Amino acid sequence: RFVFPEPTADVNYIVMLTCAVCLVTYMVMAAILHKLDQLDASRGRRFKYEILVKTGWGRGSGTTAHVGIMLYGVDSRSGHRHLDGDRAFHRNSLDIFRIATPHSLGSVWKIRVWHDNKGLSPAWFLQHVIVRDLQTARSAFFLVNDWLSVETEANGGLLLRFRRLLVAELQRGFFDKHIWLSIWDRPPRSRFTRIQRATCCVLLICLFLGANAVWYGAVGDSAYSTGHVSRLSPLSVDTVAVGLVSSVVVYPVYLAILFLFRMSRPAWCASLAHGLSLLLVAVAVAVSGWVGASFPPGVSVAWLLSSSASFLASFLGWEPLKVLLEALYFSLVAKRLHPFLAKEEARKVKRLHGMLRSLLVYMLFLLVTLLASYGDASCHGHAYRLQSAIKQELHSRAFLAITRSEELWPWMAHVLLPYVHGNQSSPELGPPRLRQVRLQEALYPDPPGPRVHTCSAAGGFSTSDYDVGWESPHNGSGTWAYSAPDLLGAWSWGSCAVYDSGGYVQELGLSLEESRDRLRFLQLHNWLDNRSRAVFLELTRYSPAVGLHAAVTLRLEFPAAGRALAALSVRPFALRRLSAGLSLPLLTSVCLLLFAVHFAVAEARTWHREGRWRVLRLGAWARWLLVALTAATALVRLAQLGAADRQWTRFVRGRPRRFTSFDQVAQLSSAARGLAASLLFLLLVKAAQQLRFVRQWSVFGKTLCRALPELLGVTLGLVVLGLWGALRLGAVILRWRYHALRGELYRP
Amino acid sequence: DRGTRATFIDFSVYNANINLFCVVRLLVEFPATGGVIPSWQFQPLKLIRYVTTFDFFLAACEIIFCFFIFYYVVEEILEIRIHKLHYFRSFWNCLDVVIVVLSVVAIGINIYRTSNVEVLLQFLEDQNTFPNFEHLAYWQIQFNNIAAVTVFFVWIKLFKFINFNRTMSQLSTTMSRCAKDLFGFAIMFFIIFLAYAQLAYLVFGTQVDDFSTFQECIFTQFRIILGDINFAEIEEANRVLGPIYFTTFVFFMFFILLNMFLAIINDTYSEVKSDLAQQKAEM
Amino acid sequence: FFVWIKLFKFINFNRTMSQLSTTMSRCAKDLFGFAIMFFIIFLAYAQLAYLVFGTQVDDFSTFQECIFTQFRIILGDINFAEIEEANRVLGPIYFTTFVFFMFFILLNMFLAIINDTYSEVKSDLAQQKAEM
Amino acid sequence: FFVWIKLFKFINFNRTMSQLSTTMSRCAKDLFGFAIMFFIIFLAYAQLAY
Amino acid sequence: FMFFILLNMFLAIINDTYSEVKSDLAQQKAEM
Amino acid sequence: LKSVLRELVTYLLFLIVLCILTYGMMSSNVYYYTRMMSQLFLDTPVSK
């Protein structure tokens, strides 16, 4: 069922962005992992208490004695001890255990004795190095004190039955062979190098992405799951199923390289595996990028969900299976029986681990924000061209250049009426309106000429009902009702007064003859002749070729009789509704909320753990800004979706004689991407700030931070005095601090 | 009708007074959202080149240029296997390869565009039909671009041979020693630059025209740095984020992050002069 | 013009004016040395612009016009509306690289040279006069 | 205006990082000595242009 | 001569004054 | 160091007094009277 569609010349941005993030998060992770495993390579050669271990009972011990202790327990693993010293259990001599063994459980079953008799095997009795209490008291003061033999073994609590072999094999490789969370649990003296775990992980990620991409669009004729019935919402029968099917298929290719890194110190294939994996990653990215370009917008979300389910299957039920089967194999086949400066090194390792586990969260957040912003960054050019075409076709300059109030009738006579109705410009989507405001405060003409530019005669607004011409009730309510403003959608931000969605409105007709008849009827019956603050002509538009709307608003307001202040605005937007399912904006608006909650809980935890006086500290303010911005971005988009759905329903209810004023949706849709475009700015700035970790490039940020107070002081002084190219003080102020920090960095 | 998407007009002229053709193309394209976008192109070709003595002189110059490129190819490949290999941390041997490659590409393009001239003879046989010269006018443009870039790089290569005294060696060393620091700071500069560019593109990129595309945002920001464009049109695009973007961009990219280049260059020059002066103070 | 210039010979007896004139005198060899490096790049850029835009922009129609247009760009008197439409590639590349390599890199060497020479001249003059 | 000037003068006598930028007014004997060798050239060029 | 040679002496004078003021003020602070 | 700020009490009191005087001297009846006089006469159409 393999097909060769190539049906479009467009590009899908979701797949490209996902692959780019999944590759950058591997490059940076590999750099950090190399900088970390250098330590393991150079080091491969306090629960344990350094209590008095003076040995005076083991006699007749002339041989090379080696001790191996494994402190098995909750997140603890140990090894042998270096027998280097003056005697170090030499001929007819004893020794004590004193090494750097940080992994050791507490008062739990942590006992394992391995005695190696290199050379001779002299019979002696050395019980143990008893420990009572120094820091954590990992054990007690007791020992079986077995005799000396040829590589004897001893086990204790706080080859035999399977109950010990299986447990030992499981615990040894439970988080060692689980390659996902194995980067943080590399066993010392292992040749798997911790830098080729990150290669297999990214290989699995890109293979999942490639398989899911090739399944969607190419193999879609045997199940017909292509758009029309492939509901992007989780059916739990075709998304997770495809994820599992894609996950199982990759392993026969993944396992052929994972087994090749291990057991390869088997001659030199370790470097060949790297090249093979980097070729597979490249081909898997290329095929996805070429195939997904034909994805309709409604299937990329399904692809993302399927890939996420695929990864989660290879993490909670496929890798534990592999370690369990491998442990059962080793416990059933071959009967294997063998499974002051240091503080600064521990601190460095902890810092590197924190960096490593924060980088992934930052990259996930960056991916979510990028999909929220540029997930639909293909309607931007179309929107710009659509607004430009509407403005040049509607003669904008010929409109707002009018200066007197009766040019409006010729204006609607020659350009507006041919535009609204006719064999051309068919997509209209609703008749126009002429909702005008009154001001109730008819004003005499102002002194002609240069004005004070300040709005004058600011009075009240008329609200009562009137009749044809003006106020003349005969029996009941008037025929020119006020049409009270709607709750949602208003506030055009007038030149000298904020308006709303209320005012006396006309319908402008539906055909040429009736439209012109109505225009004449209202013109010769004193409609726009009185005070007549503003007119507010605004209709709509729709564009089916691209799938975009536009809210058109033409404002003509008269602060003073005689002067015509005109303005216009075309706001293109895409009408996407909340009832459309699980569209991408709904997916990334319920994901940013999770990140906002995570940041809020991880920051409010500090105040109950650090107390007060955290104010005035920049870290306690630049983090509460991120929570507010993320919540605002996630909430404005949801409000826009709800508003669009409500407006569309209200429209379809009464289309032939309704207007429905889609401008509120156009404003909310502008704000939503005005907010999600600033959060990405903060993320990029933080990415720039995180460049300080290179040794020789760490001075720029420090110089800027140190010299910022003086620059602000100088700017404040200049402001108080009330340009810069002549007496350049920024250059010298930065130069002095740069020299000082370079000096303090060079010689020490 | 409404279904048309583009419309082209093509013709050409000769002007026998100076032997120089000129092909003309006029394009108006009607997007699917309405409107018309006109465009034009005038290209003065020359297809009967071998007419005068100066043409023969120029042909001889091209032959000499080809011989020089062959000589440079052999004298650069002599310093690969006979001598040091992977000596690419020099920037003066990573620039000769660029010149040689561009010159070879230019020679190939010229041979291709002058070896397929059958359109002129075909038209000259029957002179009542449309002369199809639209292909030659494309290769002429490509040849012009390649030749211009090659000339620029050949002129840049002159810096290798100006070290005749101390006052020039000092400047060359000052330029060479601050290249790494400048490269280190340029990344941090351009990350924030691109962040501003994308913010402008997403916010204003629909109603301003100057930020209509990403490239336009980049060029507009460069012109802001030059102090060319003013914010008279940004403000009405967005009342709230109009002035904030302009003032904050100017503040943080005109005398805070723009002065670091000056600081680095001044400090490095002072250090280099001090070191070479102290080196002489022991004779 | 030259008669007005020659006045510097006489007001150079004031100590501050003497210091300023000495600063000009002892950095004139470095400024002229760097002027060659500046103008080689300037002429390369000008000739590239002449070859690319030389038939469509009327500011690059001849070589000296390219020179003067670049000098005007340094002050910030560019239009860029017809450079981009003349050539959509090599039109913006030329402009961006020229602006970067002149405003950010090359024009700061003059400032560095003048500042360093002035500082060392003042230090030497003060130290020499302090021996009295 | 006198009160504002007195406040500005007191700001000059405030803590560091703002007094550093007003002690530079001690060496105003050069900023005047430079402006007299900058207007000789300016008038020479103006006369040539005229 | 007015953009490369004469507008930079002004900045040079300002920078030298600032450097001297900072240096002797810091020396005074270090001594007392 | 504290002696310098010991004498700042007089300066602070003088600044507060000056600010209070500026606030209290910028009220109405100073320019409002002039505006009312200009509206009543000396700026108006004498004849209809």
Convert A302-334 into a string of H (helix), E (strand) and C (coil).
Answer: HHHHHHHHHHHHCCCCCHHHHHHHHHHHHHHCC
Residue D27 contacts residue E17 (beta carbons within 8 Å): yes
Cβ distance D7 to F15 less than 8 Å, yes or no, reads yes
Give residues 168 to 227 of B whose Cβ lies within 8 Å of C. 168, 170-171, 174, 182, 215, 218-219, 222-223, 225-227
Distance in Å, alpha carbon of E10 to nearest chain A alpha carbon: 6
Determine which helix (DSSP H) or strand (DSSP E) holds B248, and give its type and residue range: helix B241-254
Residues in F touching D3 (Cβ below 8 Å):
14-15, 18
Distance between CA A285 and CA A273 in Å, rounded? 18
Q: Which ranges of C1-132 does DSSP label H, i.e. alpha helix?
A: 2-5, 15-53, 63-75, 81-86, 92-99, 107-129
Partner-chain contact C17 D29, CB within 8 Å? no
Distance CA C73, CA C46 (A): 12
State the Cα–Cα distance between residues A97 and A53, nearest whole angstrom. 8
Q: How far D23 CA sits from the closest chain C CA (Å)? A: 18
Tell me which residue of B200, B213, B193 sits closest to B257, measured CA to CA: B193
Please name which of C32, B259, D44 lies closest in space to residue A727, comparing C-alpha atoms.
B259
Return the SS3 of E31. Answer: helix
DSSP A685: H
* Helix/strand/coil for A703: helix
| Burial zone of B220 (CB within 10 Å; 0-12 exposed, 13-18 middle, 19+ buried) | buried
Give yes or no for a contact between A549 and A386, defined as CB atoms under 8 angstroms apart. no
User: Mutating which of E1, E6, E8 best tests the C interface, going by the most C Cβ atoms within 10 A?
Assistant: E8
Rounded distance, CA A395 to CA A415, Å? 8
Query: Helix, strand, or coil here: A66?
Result: strand
Chain D positions touching A714 (Cβ under 8 A) are 21
Cα–Cα distance, A347 to A628 (Å, whole number): 33
Q: Cα(A103)–Cα(A262) distance, rounded to whole angstroms? A: 24
State in Å, rounded, how far the first CA of chain C is from the last one. Answer: 40
Counted across chains A and D, CB pairs separated by less than 8 A come out at 14
A and F interact (at least 3 Cβ pairs within 8 A): no
Phi-psi region of A137 (alpha: psi -120 to 50; beta: other; left: phi over 0): left
Considering only CB atoms, which chain C residues are within 8 Å of E15?
A: 115, 119
Q: What angle, rounded to 10 degrees, do the helices at C107-129 and E7-31 form?
A: 50
Neighbours of B51 (CB within 10 A): 10
The identity of residue B92, as a single letter, is W
Of C5, C11, C16, nearest to D29 by CB-CB distance is C16
Q: Quick check: D5 contacting F, CB < 8 Å?
A: no
What single-letter amino acid sits at B146?
Answer: I
- Which H helix or E strand runs over A699? helix A699-721
Pairwise CB contact (< 8 Å): E12 & C119: yes
B2, B188, B202 ranked by CB distance to A677: nearest: B202
Complete edge-to-edge strand list for the sheet that includes strand B37-43: B6-13, B22-29, B37-43
Residues of chain C neighbouring D39 (CB-CB closer than 8 A): none
CA distance E3 to chain C (A): 9
Residue A493 token pair: 């931000």
Ligand-binding site membership of C106 (annotated): no
In the three-class reduction of DSSP (H, G, I as helix; E, B as strand; rest coil), residue A737 is classed as: helix
* Collapsed DSSP state (helix, strand, coil) of residue B129: coil
- For chain C, say whether D41 makes contact (Cβ under 8 Å): yes
Give, to the nearest 10 degrees, the angle between helix B179-204 and helix B241-254. 180
Backbone torsion region of residue A442, taken as left when φ is above 0, otherwise alpha when ψ lies between -120 and 50, otherwise beta: beta
Contacts of A738 in chain B (CB under 8 A): 260, 263-264, 267
Whether D41 sits inside 8 A of E1 (CB atoms) is: yes
Buried b (16+ CB within 10 A) or exposed e, A190-209: eebbbbbbbbbbbbbbbbbb
Dihedral angle, C-alpha A627, A629, A635, A639, nearest 10 °: 170
Burial code (b: 16+ CB inside 10 Å, e: under 16) for A664-699 equals bbbbbbbbbbbbbbbbbbbbbeebbeebeeeeebeb
Residues in chain C: 132
DSSP-assigned beta bridge partners for residue A572: A550
Asked if D8 lies within 8 A of A709 by C-beta distance, the reply is no
DSSP state of A444: P
E18 φ, ψ to 5°? Answer: -60, -45
For B139, the 3-state DSSP assignment is: helix
Q: What is the 3-state secondary structure (H, E, C) of D1-50?
A: CHHHHHHHHHHHCCCCCCCCCCHHHHCHHHHHHHHHHHHHHHHHHHHHHC
Of the partner residues B32, B206, B264, the one whose CB lies closest to the CB of residue A572: B206
Q: Which residues contact A707 (CB under 8 A, 6 or more apart)?
A: A733, A734, A737
- Determined by which method? cryo-EM
Q: What is the DSSP string of chain F?
A: -HHHHHTHHHHHHHHHHHHHHHHHHSSSSSSHHHHHHHHHTTSS-S--
| Burial of residue A314, with CB atoms counted within 10 A of its CB: 0-12 exposed, 13-18 middle, 19 or more buried | buried
Nearest of C53, C55, C43, C33 to residue C98 by alpha carbon: C43
The CB-side HSE value for A242 (13 A sphere, CA atoms) comes to: 27
Please report residues of D whose CB lies closer than 8 A to that of A717: 11, 18, 21
Contact A91, A10 (CB under 8 A): no
Q: Dihedrals φ, ψ of A611, to 5°?
A: 85, -165
How much is the CA Rg of chain B, to the nearest whole Å? 27
The amino acid at residue A684 is L
Distances (CA, A) of C68 to A91, B148, B238, C56: 93, 19, 38, 17
Residue appearing with tokens 């919540």: A631
Provide the token pair at B156: 């840049």
Cα separation, B267 vs B269, in Å, equals: 6
| A729·E14 Cβ contact <8 A | yes
Q: Enumerate the residues of chain A whose CB falls inside 8 A of the CB of residue D21.
A: 710, 713-714, 717, 729
Neighbours of F9 (CB within 10 A): 9
Chosen from B168, B212, B219 to mutate, greatest number of chain C CBs within 10 A: B219
| Edge-to-edge strands, sheet with A153-155 | A64-69, A112-118, A153-155
Q: Chain D residues with CB inside 8 Å of C17's CB?
A: 33, 36-37
Q: Which residues contact residue B41 at a Cβ distance below 8 angstroms, ignoring those fewer than 6 apart?
A: B24, B25, B26, B27, B137
Q: What share of chain A is helix, strand, coil (3-state, %, to 5)?
A: 50, 5, 45
Q: How many CB atoms lie within 10 A of CB D1?
A: 5
For residue A239, CA distances in Å to A217, A234, A368, A444, A724 come to: 14, 6, 20, 71, 61
> β-strand A541-543 against A548-557: which pairing, if any?
antiparallel
Radius of gyration of chain A (CA): 38
3-state secondary structure of B246: helix
The yes-or-no reply on C/E contact (3 CB pairs or more, < 8 Å) is yes
In a 13 Å sphere around the CA of B110, the CA atoms on its Cβ side amount to: 16
Tally of CB atoms within 10 A around B260: 24
- Residue entry with tokens 């561009």: B102
A198 touches A30 (CB < 8 A):
yes
The answer to whether C122 contacts E16, with C-beta atoms less than 8 Å apart, is: yes
**For residue B241, what are the contacts with CB-CB under 8 A and spacing of at least 6?**
A674, B203
A591's CB contacts (< 8 A; 6+ apart) are: A368
Q: Please, what's the b/e burial string for F11-23 (b: 16 or more CB within 10 A of its CB; e: otherwise)?
A: eeeebeeeeeeee
Helix (H) or strand (E) holding B24: strand B22-29
DSSP-derived letter for residue B22 is E
Cα distance between the two ends of chain F: 73
Contact with chain E for residue C114, Cβ under 8 A: yes
Cα A206 to Cα A15, A259, A279, B136, C75: the distances in Å are: 11, 19, 11, 45, 51
Map tokens 């029957």 to a residue. B126
**Residues from chain E contacting residue D48 (CB–CB below 8 Å):** none
Contact indicator for A596, A634 with CB cutoff of 8 Å: yes
C contact chains, 3+ CB pairs < 8 A: B, D, E
Q: How far apart are CA D16 and CA C127, in angstroms?
A: 29
> CA A363, CA A358: separation in Å to the nearest integer?
9
Whether residues E13 and D23 touch (CB distance < 8 A) is answered with no
Q: Do A714 and D11 touch (CB under 8 A)?
A: no
Yes or no: say if A681 and B199 are a contact pair by the CB < 8 Å rule. yes
> Where is A114: in which H helix or E strand?
strand A112-118
Report residue A476 as tokens: 């009941």
In sequence order, the β-bridge partners of residue B41 are: B25
Nearest chain E CA: its distance from D15 CA (Å): 13
Q: At a CB cut-off of 8 Å and minimum separation 6, what does B234 contact?
A: B204, B208, B242, B243, B245, B246
The token duo for A65 is: 């004695």
E12 burial type by CB count under 10 A (0-12 exposed, 13-18 middle, 19+ buried):
buried
Strand residue runs (E) in A465-547: 541-543
**Burial class of residue A151 (count of CB atoms within 10 Å of its CB; 0-12, 13-18, 19+):** exposed
SS3 per-residue string spanning A571-592: EEECCCCHHHCCCHHHHHHCCH
Cβ–Cβ < 8 Å for A352, A35: yes
The residue written with tokens 């405060």 in the block is A441
A118-123 contacts, C-beta under 8 A, 24 or more apart? A118/A63, A118/A64, A118/A65, A118/A66, A119/A63, A119/A64, A120/A62, A120/A63, A120/A64, A121/A63, A121/A148, A121/A149, A121/A150, A122/A60, A122/A61, A122/A62, A122/A63, A122/A148, A123/A60, A123/A147, A123/A148
Q: How far is CA A195 from CA A164, A198, A708, in A?
A: 32, 6, 40
Helix (H, G, I), strand (E, B) or coil at A181: helix
CB–CB of A98/A50 below 8 Å? yes
Which element (helix H / strand E) includes B107? helix B96-115
Strand-pair partners of B38 = B28
Task: Give CA–CA dist A583/A375, Å, rounded.
Answer: 11
Give C16's contacts in chain D (Cβ within 8 Å). Answer: 29-30, 33
- Alpha carbon distance A467, A478 (integer Å): 5
Residue with tokens 């003013």: B230
Largest CA distance in chain A: 129
CB contact at 8 A, A521 and A509: no
